């Protein structure tokens, strides 16, 4: 690939060199590998979480008695494990022969944690089998160990899908990069009150923006649109997961 | 390009291998070729189709008497053939010498059909010369032959531009990949009722999201913004095509 | 990288060859270099410029007496120079060793001008030190020289960040390409009146869409979300720059 020409940055002013942690460097390398290997498409959708939010906030009592904080992330994780079982092409990887997909029969999901040293994506195993408070507990633990560098490499392996939530900082949407060999990643941004037409007038609903980037070699456009739609449907009523 | 490291997926659970159809494999190869060759930008816009929709629905009678179904796709095709003649840099391809553009004086447009076996993009020739019911007829035929594998390779060649419509499944927008050697592709997503300021209050208008990805080597930002704007203008009043 | 197969375009109709200016060719080459080198993510945000706009329009008198036109661009430039000093990772470049960042202690910003011959990105030096009317003056001058080919190569060097404004043509958002060796670019699109929930009802506010694409090797998701958020905050009240 052509290299970027070097520039004497100091011709233009004072410069200072700060170095990259080995974590940054690793991260850099892996992102570039994915970028060049995966033809990326991002599919955007908005989900109506007005009722999810109300539920979340009402279980604050129960969550506190169990020692967890109930955030949107366990809810996101549960709904995506369910969908990853329904739409198995999203829970698979392109086999090295380029002619086969390896469908995984297990659902382990990573979530992005931004730490001082760089990005870590701890993995929760068998998300499909854990309850909302189990997942809330575990997510937090893995997050604290990640910030504290106490996260052992084991816990960073064998994920099937990644959720990257920036909803806590802000933004309308973004286009995340697929962590190959996985085939998709869900970016989640800040929720806003939006007017949503009820057939007769505009009702304020709390809308969560979802950005699903996918490996277009493995997932086609219609499959991805169907995935964010189902997910919008599941978050609008999490009871459908009970069915 | 660095390869993705192989992972023993079975360390983490039960895996199953399903194979890729030759169609998937072809598709995979071509998408990756475009991805690495084309510096991609997507330009997003929303078009007011309230009046297009009303027209569409009112001609249901005439369409039924002719045996066609009038969808938004013939309307999309007609308006883009008109624009492809107005803004010819979008109807061209980068010549192999990298120093010339080949402007095509003909307008043939492909549209994406997702079939069981993979993606096919049948091509309608001389879109600029056909009427809305001719195009509605032909689109359907090519679509049925595509699903039925009866589409002969001939009908998959020499397109100038591609429309990818996911409006029927859902979604807010996406970033499609350019089918090189073409220089642009129009993604269309689901139409929603949106509040649109009329200068004094917000009026509900039916808005169609458009996502135009383009080859930034050939098309610059202003040209693309001008293309989706004109298209938003043409769909808001299809009578401008008569002018 | 696999080449695109040549197609005899004339099998399908009449073609005509027009050539590329040396400017287009240069541009093409550089964009492809960035594209293959930079793993790109775009972060989208909307900023409330209702009060910025009112200010802009009220200073029309003063601007006219000084001979400048006060557009949103000097306002954009001032606010980004301030942020580029606050969040220095955005004002830096990946050192050729891949293991260091070169933080620039100066703020020079380029802005995209689309000319007949291709794209030029004139650079304003030390944006952080100039006033809104100085910047309005200079932006215009560099723009006129650019259209008139009187822009000397000197003035196209050593920028730290680029703003690409298409707000004057239209569009909702786009995904700009990073001009490597810079690490980020701000795309700005057309401002619209939007309903924004005030806690009790929807208030019409003039919203400006911002699309920040960044080099994900150097900038992580949270840093970028934090940058467009701060920028949304600064444009909602430019007096925070005084602090």
XYZ file of C-alpha atoms in Angstrom:
729
model
C 0.000 0.000 0.000
C 1.639 3.400 -0.813
C 3.230 4.948 2.368
C 2.385 8.405 3.601
C 5.280 10.789 2.809
C 7.160 12.065 5.926
C 6.779 15.725 6.774
C 9.184 17.815 8.828
C 6.430 19.035 11.212
C 8.760 21.352 12.962
C 9.066 23.633 9.870
C 5.649 24.923 10.864
C 6.172 25.305 14.597
C 7.179 23.705 17.846
C 6.426 19.971 18.029
C 6.774 17.523 20.903
C 6.943 13.694 20.635
C 4.925 11.578 23.019
C 5.114 7.758 22.575
C 2.490 5.124 22.068
C 1.840 2.499 24.694
C 2.302 -1.034 23.459
C -1.518 -1.278 23.855
C -2.058 1.601 21.369
C 0.346 -0.005 18.948
C -1.349 -3.346 19.129
C -4.693 -1.657 18.690
C -3.401 0.330 15.724
C -2.167 -2.770 13.995
C -5.323 -4.724 14.486
C -7.595 -1.924 13.293
C -5.601 -1.465 10.150
C -5.705 -5.247 9.507
C -9.527 -5.256 9.805
C -9.837 -2.103 7.728
C -7.941 -3.558 4.816
C -9.585 -6.980 5.087
C -13.206 -6.214 5.675
C -15.373 -4.320 3.118
C -17.348 -2.268 5.674
C -20.947 -1.073 5.538
C -22.745 0.614 8.440
C -26.496 0.289 8.808
C -28.152 2.885 10.964
C -31.436 2.491 12.930
C -33.165 4.092 15.966
C -34.841 2.009 18.645
C -37.647 3.193 20.916
C -36.397 2.602 24.390
C -39.023 4.745 26.291
C -40.407 1.679 27.946
C -36.989 -0.016 28.366
C -35.858 3.096 30.234
C -38.830 3.189 32.525
C -38.164 -0.497 33.351
C -34.457 0.203 33.953
C -35.133 3.060 36.302
C -37.912 1.157 38.188
C -35.566 -1.776 38.919
C -33.039 0.643 40.535
C -34.164 -0.710 43.917
C -33.605 -4.387 43.092
C -30.311 -3.625 41.299
C -29.032 -1.713 44.365
C -30.019 -4.609 46.708
C -27.979 -6.956 44.464
C -25.010 -4.548 44.370
C -25.154 -3.945 40.592
C -26.046 -0.935 38.569
C -28.565 -1.654 35.882
C -27.381 0.257 32.775
C -28.603 -0.141 29.124
C -25.641 -2.461 28.421
C -27.004 -5.729 30.036
C -30.251 -4.998 28.228
C -28.319 -4.548 24.964
C -26.302 -7.704 25.597
C -29.364 -9.864 26.371
C -31.267 -8.672 23.283
C -28.236 -9.160 20.967
C -27.572 -12.733 22.335
C -31.145 -13.575 21.477
C -30.798 -12.132 17.987
C -27.402 -13.783 17.449
C -29.169 -17.113 17.946
C -32.048 -16.115 15.614
C -29.903 -14.790 12.763
C -26.834 -17.143 12.942
C -24.902 -15.618 10.032
C -24.068 -12.793 12.453
C -22.654 -15.286 14.915
C -20.103 -16.751 12.541
C -16.703 -16.119 10.932
C -15.186 -16.450 7.495
C -13.159 -19.585 7.454
C -9.517 -19.151 6.255
C -10.340 -21.017 3.000
C -12.611 -18.032 1.997
C -15.228 -20.621 0.994
C -16.870 -21.470 4.281
C -18.379 -19.795 7.246
C -17.806 -21.140 10.653
C -21.035 -20.829 12.581
C -20.437 -20.682 16.244
C -23.056 -22.441 18.403
C -22.097 -20.386 21.488
C -22.756 -16.642 22.147
C -19.900 -14.740 23.819
C -19.966 -10.953 23.376
C -17.220 -8.352 23.932
C -17.824 -4.749 24.901
C -15.433 -1.901 24.432
C -13.834 -0.270 27.442
C -11.680 2.792 26.897
C -8.875 2.781 29.425
C -5.841 5.143 29.861
C -3.613 2.729 28.141
C -5.819 2.091 25.147
C -8.887 0.121 24.215
C -9.692 -3.261 25.733
C -12.647 -5.419 24.761
C -13.420 -7.773 27.655
C -15.651 -10.735 26.646
C -18.692 -12.085 28.552
C -19.137 -15.769 27.867
C -22.529 -17.345 27.218
C -24.477 -14.111 27.337
C -27.482 -16.102 26.193
C -27.561 -17.921 29.565
C -27.187 -15.112 32.017
C -29.776 -12.848 33.517
C -29.871 -9.104 33.416
C -28.387 -8.759 36.913
C -25.744 -11.422 36.275
C -24.662 -9.576 33.165
C -24.777 -6.179 34.990
C -22.488 -7.572 37.662
C -20.009 -9.218 35.349
C -19.840 -6.283 32.896
C -18.805 -4.011 35.762
C -16.205 -6.401 37.133
C -14.571 -6.916 33.758
C -14.670 -3.152 33.270
C -12.948 -2.433 36.611
C -10.258 -5.092 35.946
C -9.756 -3.613 32.488
C -9.147 -0.103 33.902
C -6.922 -1.556 36.510
C -4.832 -3.645 34.039
C -5.856 -6.722 36.038
C -7.688 -8.191 33.047
C -6.022 -11.427 31.982
C -5.677 -12.076 28.186
C -7.923 -15.111 28.512
C -10.916 -12.811 29.098
C -10.208 -11.036 25.838
C -10.778 -14.062 23.601
C -13.308 -15.897 21.551
C -15.994 -13.275 21.271
C -18.572 -13.559 18.549
C -19.776 -9.923 18.342
C -18.837 -6.571 19.942
C -20.975 -3.749 21.350
C -19.306 -0.293 21.511
C -21.365 2.125 23.590
C -20.566 5.822 23.470
C -24.069 6.837 24.622
C -22.611 8.173 27.845
C -20.499 10.828 26.078
C -22.655 11.937 23.228
C -23.170 11.809 19.541
C -25.743 10.913 17.068
C -24.167 7.835 15.382
C -20.747 6.706 14.207
C -19.346 4.003 11.923
C -17.452 1.451 14.109
C -14.788 -0.925 12.716
C -15.415 -4.618 12.737
C -13.050 -6.558 14.946
C -12.108 -9.286 12.476
C -12.441 -12.272 12.644
C -15.925 -11.305 13.938
C -18.370 -10.259 11.239
C -20.301 -7.370 12.904
C -20.126 -4.707 15.769
C -23.027 -2.651 17.265
C -22.257 0.974 18.021
C -24.711 2.675 20.393
C -24.877 6.465 20.783
C -26.752 8.984 22.951
C -30.488 8.653 23.412
C -32.666 11.676 22.719
C -36.306 12.535 22.972
C -37.608 12.586 19.438
C -41.007 13.256 17.880
C -42.387 10.113 16.463
C -45.569 10.157 14.415
C -48.319 8.085 15.986
C -50.511 8.175 12.873
C -52.117 11.472 13.989
C -49.601 13.691 15.838
C -46.030 13.563 16.984
C -45.433 11.817 20.275
C -42.110 12.257 22.176
C -40.370 8.959 22.383
C -36.869 8.248 23.729
C -34.909 7.046 20.769
C -31.528 5.200 20.984
C -29.323 5.435 17.819
C -27.806 2.130 16.693
C -25.006 1.870 14.097
C -24.252 -1.707 12.977
C -21.101 -2.014 10.851
C -20.713 -5.432 9.116
C -18.489 -7.499 6.950
C -20.248 -7.214 3.645
C -18.572 -10.403 2.323
C -20.508 -12.433 4.815
C -23.547 -10.183 5.493
C -25.607 -8.561 2.752
C -27.625 -5.418 3.036
C -30.997 -6.989 3.602
C -29.740 -9.255 6.382
C -28.216 -6.325 8.228
C -31.369 -4.139 7.838
C -33.368 -7.075 9.160
C -30.970 -7.371 12.133
C -31.186 -3.732 13.268
C -34.983 -3.802 12.697
C -35.447 -6.915 14.906
C -33.176 -5.303 17.479
C -35.251 -2.105 17.379
C -38.298 -4.326 17.903
C -36.738 -6.230 20.795
C -35.655 -3.051 22.617
C -39.064 -1.468 22.148
C -40.511 -4.511 24.034
C -37.927 -6.780 25.830
C -40.729 -9.204 26.705
C -40.513 -10.598 23.165
C -37.312 -12.274 24.366
C -39.516 -14.432 26.636
C -41.346 -15.972 23.774
C -2.363 -6.620 2.989
C -1.728 -8.296 6.409
C -3.889 -11.496 6.787
C -6.227 -12.052 9.687
C -4.692 -14.609 12.095
C -6.579 -17.971 12.227
C -8.416 -18.778 15.427
C -9.375 -22.233 16.653
C -13.064 -21.277 17.132
C -13.874 -24.567 18.674
C -11.791 -23.783 21.821
C -14.713 -21.604 22.840
C -17.576 -23.929 21.974
C -19.280 -26.043 19.375
C -18.854 -24.753 15.812
C -20.376 -25.956 12.554
C -19.079 -25.215 9.015
C -21.521 -24.229 6.314
C -20.072 -23.423 2.839
C -20.344 -20.420 0.604
C -22.139 -20.617 -2.705
C -19.978 -19.718 -5.662
C -22.227 -16.602 -5.885
C -21.232 -15.508 -2.340
C -17.594 -16.072 -3.159
C -17.759 -14.055 -6.318
C -19.581 -11.323 -4.461
C -17.011 -11.384 -1.668
C -14.158 -10.989 -4.083
C -15.696 -8.150 -5.978
C -16.634 -6.187 -2.864
C -13.157 -6.459 -1.483
C -11.709 -5.314 -4.848
C -13.939 -2.197 -4.818
C -13.228 -1.549 -1.153
C -9.495 -1.473 -1.654
C -9.685 0.473 -4.919
C -12.248 3.127 -4.258
C -11.786 5.837 -1.563
C -15.426 5.882 -0.380
C -17.500 8.782 0.920
C -21.233 8.579 1.640
C -23.402 11.666 1.346
C -26.690 11.524 3.161
C -29.898 13.452 2.268
C -33.683 13.145 2.860
C -36.196 13.690 0.083
C -39.811 14.752 0.566
C -41.832 12.123 -1.161
C -45.301 13.022 0.343
C -46.575 14.007 -3.043
C -44.697 11.223 -4.902
C -46.433 8.742 -2.604
C -49.869 10.151 -3.152
C -49.240 9.911 -6.928
C -47.980 6.320 -6.592
C -50.983 5.197 -4.627
C -53.471 7.032 -6.938
C -52.085 5.256 -10.031
C -52.710 1.842 -8.356
C -55.696 1.434 -10.690
C -53.782 2.081 -13.919
C -50.805 -0.013 -12.735
C -53.128 -2.962 -11.964
C -54.798 -2.681 -15.426
C -51.302 -2.874 -16.991
C -50.303 -5.835 -14.788
C -47.461 -4.005 -12.990
C -47.059 -2.861 -9.458
C -46.000 0.728 -9.179
C -43.351 0.843 -6.409
C -40.914 3.729 -5.561
C -38.199 1.999 -7.632
C -39.376 3.026 -11.196
C -39.786 6.525 -9.806
C -36.240 6.366 -8.392
C -34.887 4.963 -11.652
C -36.553 7.626 -13.837
C -35.341 10.506 -11.644
C -31.752 9.136 -11.462
C -31.593 8.613 -15.306
C -32.538 12.242 -15.699
C -29.892 13.349 -13.217
C -27.258 11.037 -14.725
C -27.721 12.961 -17.972
C -27.582 16.347 -16.171
C -24.488 15.634 -14.072
C -22.426 13.394 -16.463
C -19.448 12.851 -14.147
C -21.714 10.413 -12.289
C -22.335 8.508 -15.493
C -18.696 7.769 -16.200
C -15.780 5.522 -15.201
C -12.108 5.954 -14.455
C -10.207 4.864 -17.478
C -7.448 2.251 -16.808
C -4.746 4.894 -17.490
C -5.886 6.728 -14.263
C -5.762 9.955 -16.294
C -9.071 9.935 -18.103
C -12.702 9.458 -17.425
C -14.827 7.588 -19.820
C -18.158 9.349 -20.035
C -20.864 7.039 -21.104
C -23.529 8.577 -23.372
C -26.071 5.862 -22.461
C -27.920 5.368 -19.111
C -28.285 1.748 -17.955
C -28.940 1.272 -14.228
C -28.636 -1.852 -12.046
C -30.672 -2.516 -8.931
C -29.782 -4.889 -6.171
C -31.821 -8.030 -5.659
C -31.048 -10.208 -2.663
C -31.641 -13.820 -3.591
C -31.027 -17.084 -1.606
C -27.842 -17.677 -3.410
C -26.390 -14.223 -2.966
C -26.720 -10.767 -4.419
C -27.499 -10.148 -8.080
C -27.688 -6.732 -9.702
C -29.835 -7.007 -12.837
C -29.409 -4.033 -15.232
C -32.193 -2.093 -17.019
C -30.914 -0.655 -20.264
C -31.745 2.861 -21.425
C -33.694 3.828 -18.338
C -33.812 7.336 -19.743
C -36.126 6.133 -22.552
C -38.653 4.075 -20.703
C -41.808 5.112 -18.956
C -42.744 4.503 -15.380
C -44.906 1.479 -16.238
C -42.320 0.059 -18.642
C -39.705 0.275 -15.928
C -42.129 -1.180 -13.303
C -42.750 -4.148 -15.565
C -39.151 -4.820 -16.461
C -37.828 -4.358 -12.898
C -40.208 -7.073 -11.714
C -39.351 -9.483 -14.508
C -35.621 -9.144 -13.961
C -36.250 -9.565 -10.241
C -38.257 -12.790 -10.703
C -35.627 -14.239 -13.096
C -32.936 -13.288 -10.597
C -34.677 -15.183 -7.757
C -35.264 -18.055 -10.053
C -31.624 -18.231 -11.303
C -32.987 -17.717 -14.823
C -31.128 -14.420 -15.179
C -28.556 -14.687 -17.953
C -25.120 -13.019 -17.351
C -25.769 -10.662 -20.247
C -28.400 -8.846 -18.156
C -25.839 -8.225 -15.447
C -23.532 -6.061 -17.564
C -22.708 -2.549 -18.548
C -24.558 -0.641 -15.883
C -23.612 2.930 -15.179
C -25.013 3.340 -11.632
C -26.693 1.104 -9.014
C -29.683 1.691 -6.726
C -29.840 -0.492 -3.569
C -33.229 -0.218 -1.883
C -33.673 -1.570 1.624
C -36.698 0.661 2.334
C -38.907 -2.404 2.503
C -37.056 -3.874 5.511
C -36.148 -0.877 7.557
C -33.384 1.370 8.648
C -32.480 4.936 8.692
C -29.491 5.013 6.271
C -26.461 2.887 5.464
C -23.174 3.329 3.598
C -23.304 1.160 0.410
C -20.169 0.030 -1.480
C -19.556 1.283 -4.956
C -19.619 -1.420 -7.588
C -16.413 -0.491 -9.402
C -15.950 0.300 -12.268
C -19.067 2.456 -11.649
C -18.415 5.640 -9.701
C -21.524 5.912 -7.440
C -24.453 3.854 -5.856
C -27.714 5.199 -4.293
C -28.866 3.462 -1.138
C -32.514 4.074 -0.210
C -33.899 3.279 3.253
C -37.292 3.334 4.999
C -39.527 6.363 4.669
C -40.880 7.960 7.828
C -43.204 10.772 8.687
C -41.020 13.581 9.925
C -41.697 17.101 11.182
C -40.449 19.583 8.718
C -40.452 23.278 9.534
C -42.625 25.273 7.163
C -41.258 28.630 8.333
C -43.856 28.810 11.147
C -44.625 25.332 12.557
C -43.663 21.758 11.940
C -45.578 20.002 9.203
C -45.507 16.163 8.886
C -43.915 15.229 5.640
C -43.003 11.732 4.409
C -39.262 11.728 4.160
C -37.199 9.104 2.227
C -33.536 8.707 3.395
C -30.975 8.609 0.581
C -27.338 7.527 1.077
C -25.108 8.130 -1.970
C -21.658 6.531 -1.684
C -19.159 7.712 -4.367
C -15.704 7.270 -5.699
C -14.005 10.311 -4.298
C -11.231 10.149 -6.945
C -13.740 10.997 -9.602
C -16.458 12.817 -7.587
C -15.721 15.579 -5.093
C -17.817 16.544 -2.143
C -19.626 19.456 -3.692
C -20.646 17.487 -6.779
C -22.113 14.717 -4.659
C -24.004 17.164 -2.355
C -25.360 18.809 -5.488
C -26.452 15.385 -6.815
C -28.431 14.303 -3.734
C -29.926 17.831 -3.482
C -31.158 17.774 -7.124
C -32.486 14.275 -6.512
C -34.314 15.463 -3.382
C -35.751 18.246 -5.545
C -36.799 15.894 -8.336
C -38.540 13.462 -5.959
C -40.344 16.284 -4.190
C -41.843 17.207 -7.626
C -41.371 14.583 -10.444
C -42.915 17.028 -12.920
C -39.561 18.829 -13.100
C -38.437 15.849 -15.186
C -40.872 17.057 -17.884
C -39.099 20.305 -18.349
C -4.310 -4.744 -4.155
C -6.328 -6.607 -6.868
C -6.932 -4.317 -9.940
C -10.364 -3.614 -11.322
C -10.862 -5.583 -14.573
C -11.081 -3.374 -17.728
C -14.432 -3.195 -19.461
C -15.034 -2.288 -23.092
C -17.593 0.439 -22.213
C -18.417 1.033 -25.794
C -20.094 -2.419 -26.145
C -23.009 -0.849 -24.311
C -23.194 2.470 -26.129
C -21.420 5.597 -27.226
C -18.634 6.701 -24.868
C -16.465 9.811 -24.898
C -13.102 10.269 -23.098
C -12.433 13.463 -21.206
C -9.060 13.747 -19.370
C -8.162 14.467 -15.797
C -6.354 17.636 -14.850
C -3.056 17.045 -13.119
C -4.852 18.457 -10.021
C -7.501 15.679 -10.169
C -4.794 13.083 -10.565
C -2.833 14.353 -7.630
C -6.000 14.470 -5.584
C -6.917 10.940 -6.636
C -3.569 9.597 -5.582
C -3.564 11.264 -2.230
C -7.094 10.172 -1.348
C -6.336 6.593 -2.175
C -3.142 6.758 -0.055
C -5.134 8.031 2.962
C -7.913 5.526 2.363
C -5.581 2.568 2.466
C -3.528 3.925 5.370
C -6.088 5.268 7.755
C -8.742 3.037 9.429
C -11.611 5.561 9.217
C -14.500 6.129 11.611
C -16.977 9.006 11.319
C -18.667 10.389 14.409
C -21.819 12.345 13.803
C -23.263 15.133 16.028
C -25.636 18.135 15.679
C -24.827 21.513 17.182
C -27.378 24.154 18.158
C -26.345 27.231 16.302
C -29.607 29.286 16.788
C -27.772 31.814 18.859
C -24.561 31.660 16.762
C -26.692 32.519 13.734
C -28.400 35.438 15.365
C -24.939 36.773 16.338
C -23.626 36.244 12.789
C -26.497 38.077 11.197
C -26.389 40.955 13.768
C -22.690 41.617 13.041
C -23.495 42.014 9.293
C -23.046 45.770 9.767
C -19.590 45.570 11.357
C -18.460 42.871 8.889
C -19.534 45.061 5.933
C -17.660 48.104 7.377
C -14.516 45.917 7.578
C -15.021 44.584 4.030
C -15.477 40.930 5.078
C -18.438 38.654 5.003
C -19.042 36.908 8.269
C -19.945 33.287 7.388
C -20.113 30.230 9.756
C -16.567 29.256 8.695
C -14.547 31.780 10.861
C -16.797 30.768 13.734
C -16.060 27.091 13.002
C -12.340 27.790 12.681
C -12.119 29.741 15.965
C -14.018 27.080 17.936
C -11.942 24.200 16.456
C -8.597 26.027 17.200
C -9.709 26.306 20.791
C -10.637 22.632 20.941
C -7.440 21.570 19.151
C -5.538 23.154 22.037
C -7.807 21.498 24.650
C -7.719 17.985 23.188
C -4.120 17.824 21.771
C -4.312 14.271 20.404
C -6.373 15.787 17.577
C -3.596 18.241 16.834
C -0.935 15.624 16.236
C 0.354 13.098 13.686
C 1.547 9.520 13.723
C 5.279 9.574 13.603
C 6.847 7.412 10.819
C 8.125 4.916 13.443
C 4.432 3.967 14.173
C 5.312 4.206 17.877
C 5.065 7.907 18.560
C 2.746 10.771 18.018
C 4.072 14.109 17.100
C 2.057 16.707 18.952
C 2.114 19.988 17.209
C 2.174 23.054 19.491
C 0.812 25.317 16.719
C -2.748 25.372 15.233
C -2.942 25.839 11.449
C -6.191 24.690 9.816
C -6.999 23.992 6.145
C -10.421 24.354 4.581
C -11.588 22.729 1.413
C -12.253 24.840 -1.651
C -13.723 23.163 -4.707
C -12.342 24.829 -7.801
C -12.792 23.990 -11.551
C -9.512 22.262 -11.641
C -10.011 20.128 -8.569
C -9.896 20.430 -4.820
C -7.484 22.741 -3.022
C -7.148 23.013 0.739
C -5.645 26.414 1.569
C -4.245 26.622 5.142
C -4.744 29.477 7.652
C -1.810 29.671 10.016
C -2.209 30.247 13.747
C -5.986 30.227 13.730
C -5.813 30.315 17.506
C -4.421 33.884 17.359
C -6.708 35.551 14.903
C -10.041 37.193 15.430
C -13.280 36.383 13.730
C -12.925 39.238 11.225
C -9.255 38.475 10.568
C -10.156 34.891 9.803
C -13.177 35.976 7.663
C -10.892 38.184 5.611
C -8.115 35.680 5.138
C -10.444 32.739 4.376
C -11.944 34.732 1.509
C -8.600 35.826 0.105
C -7.190 32.313 0.116
C -10.435 31.136 -1.464
C -10.269 33.706 -4.293
C -6.577 32.905 -4.981
C -7.455 29.215 -4.985
C -10.181 29.701 -7.635
C -7.875 31.877 -9.586
C -4.918 29.412 -9.477
C -2.897 32.174 -7.804
C -2.493 30.110 -4.636
C 1.172 29.310 -4.083
C 2.040 25.759 -2.821
C 3.447 27.248 0.367
C -0.094 28.123 1.501
C -1.125 24.507 1.121
C 1.238 23.136 3.771
C 1.558 22.215 7.381
C -2.067 22.129 8.388
C -3.072 20.279 11.504
C -6.793 19.678 10.793
C -9.219 20.287 7.891
C -12.789 21.615 7.810
C -14.874 20.654 4.730
C -18.081 22.676 4.564
C -20.815 21.626 2.166
C -23.545 23.423 4.152
C -24.039 25.829 1.278
C -25.142 23.087 -1.152
C -27.110 20.733 0.989
C -27.139 17.405 2.662
C -27.628 15.909 5.989
C -24.122 14.514 6.739
C -21.336 12.740 4.883
C -18.221 10.750 5.789
C -15.134 12.830 4.774
C -11.671 11.292 4.207
C -8.848 12.203 6.495
C -6.041 14.062 4.793
C -3.136 12.020 6.145
C -0.769 12.854 7.805
C -3.453 14.789 9.753
C -5.523 12.664 12.110
C -9.052 14.169 11.745
C -11.333 16.307 9.389
C -14.651 18.068 10.271
C -17.368 17.868 7.648
C -20.181 20.411 8.055
C -23.513 20.076 6.231
C -26.715 22.114 5.838
C -28.395 23.583 8.888
C -32.083 22.895 9.423
C -34.720 23.908 11.886
C -35.317 20.893 14.064
C -37.604 20.169 17.009
C -35.592 19.805 20.110
C -37.215 18.685 23.340
C -36.935 21.291 26.070
C -38.044 18.897 28.817
C -41.732 19.718 28.168
C -42.379 20.378 24.451
C -40.450 20.561 21.237
C -38.767 23.863 20.530
C -37.478 24.713 17.000
C -33.766 25.109 17.111
C -31.384 25.615 14.171
C -29.233 22.545 14.116
C -25.905 22.237 12.188
C -24.846 18.627 11.305
C -21.198 17.822 12.033
C -19.426 14.693 10.721
C -15.942 14.144 12.199
C -13.964 11.379 10.472
C -10.786 10.311 12.369
C -7.788 8.095 12.260
C -8.831 5.369 14.623
C -5.192 4.315 15.229
C -4.556 7.572 16.978
C -8.082 8.557 18.143
C -10.442 6.178 19.922
C -14.183 6.350 19.954
C -14.620 8.068 23.272
C -12.130 10.818 22.445
C -13.901 11.591 19.192
C -17.394 11.608 20.826
C -15.977 13.954 23.443
C -14.580 16.202 20.674
C -17.837 16.615 18.723
C -19.734 17.072 22.031
C -17.399 19.894 23.199
C -17.681 21.421 19.739
C -21.487 21.233 19.914
C -21.198 22.956 23.296
C -18.863 25.662 22.012
C -21.074 26.477 19.005
C -24.184 26.605 21.164
C -22.409 29.362 23.201
C -19.190 30.839 21.616
C -18.614 32.870 24.783
C -17.187 29.742 26.427
C -14.133 30.378 24.244
C -13.520 33.522 26.345
C -13.059 31.593 29.504
